[PDB]
Amino acid sequence: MLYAQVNGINLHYEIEGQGQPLLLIMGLGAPAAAWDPIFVQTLTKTHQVIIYDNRGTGLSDKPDMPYSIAMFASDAVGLLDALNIPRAHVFGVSMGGMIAQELAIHYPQRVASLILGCTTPGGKHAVPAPLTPEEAIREGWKLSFSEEFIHTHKAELEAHIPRLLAQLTPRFAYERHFQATMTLRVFKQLKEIQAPTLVATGRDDMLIPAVNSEILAREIPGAELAIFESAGHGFVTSAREPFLKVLKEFLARQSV
């Protein structure tokens, strides 16, 4: 029910909690509904958490045009402007981590701290990826979670399916997002990032190789690296309690 109009595009967002603003940025084709709800709820105890639907997704407008990381970063800044927030902590996952990198380089004055989850800088220095819509989500789990995690957490995973199906990203928009992931151009500028930075991923990430997180942390001055054992692309869920501990500890040392 809340929207921010940024450059004529209506972006659906949700905002919750009190304290220092924390902007969460989702990855390829994913709406705000894709965030692990327990993770988000827990963060609202210490922070004002902003989640939202990128253009093309959820309840947001879906213009049929080329998307880029630069445009996504412009959208995020627009959201912060609409909310009258000068500076925010920023956490992006996957393509959302690419948007985060763009923000920290091109809009450094809006970024109080930076958390990069299961992401990559792209380009030559990056190490690349190696039926019913219900069945598709279940198939997609295998890329984010181990076979044992899926076994022991089947109810928790199944409970999220309706939420995702309620708000499908249409195929045309999914294509725009897919092609946007090719438009990041940051590698040499990573070393100019001034934000205090946490890089985090699951060691066993099958979608984005975990070495990408080492490459990021290697470039960004003063970046910390948290790699979680027995977790993959889905580490925000599969390592939720250890990651929430690390993220809360990191954010406690930060300020807006």
d(CA 117, CA 84): 26
d(CA 160, CA 37): 9
Helix (H, G, I), strand (E, B) or coil at 237: helix
- In the chain, what are the domains? 2-130+170-252 (3.40.50.1820)
Q: At what angle do helices 95-106 and 69-82 cross, to 10 degrees?
A: 70
User: Please, are residues 55 and 9 in contact by the beta-carbon 8 Å criterion?
Assistant: yes
End-to-end CA separation in angstroms for the chain? 28
CB atoms within 10 A of CB 97: 30
User: Please, are residues 244 and 231 in contact by the beta-carbon 8 Å criterion?
Assistant: no
d(CA 29, CA 240): 22
Structure tokens at 165: 């199906």
Q: Give how far Cα 249 sits from Cα of 18, 211, 221, 246, Å.
A: 17, 23, 19, 5
* Break sites following residues in the chain (C–N > 2.5 A): 130
Element (H or E) spanning 204, and its range? none
User: Please, are residues 99 and 77 in contact by the beta-carbon 8 Å criterion?
Assistant: no
Cβ burial 198-220 (10 Å sphere, 16+ → b, else e): bbbbbebbbbbbbebbebbbebb
**Phi, psi (rounded to 5 degrees) for 206:** -95, -5
Ranges of beta strands (E only) in the chain are 2-6, 9-16, 20-25, 47-52, 88-93, 111-117, 197-202, 224-228
Determination approach: X-ray
**Residue 11, beta-bridge partner list:** 4
Q: What single DSSP character describes residue 53? A: -
Nearest to 52 by CA among 88, 101, 106: 88
Amino acid code (one letter) for 225: L
Q: Give how far Cα 109 sits from Cα of 55, 106, 175, 225, Å.
A: 24, 9, 32, 23
CB atoms within 10 A of CB 110: 20
Structure tokens at 32: 């705000």
Structure tokens at 242: 């250890």
d(CA 250, CA 46): 12
Structure tokens at 95: 């393509």
- Which alpha helices (DSSP H) does 85-225 contain, by range? 95-106, 133-141, 147-152, 154-165, 171-180, 211-219
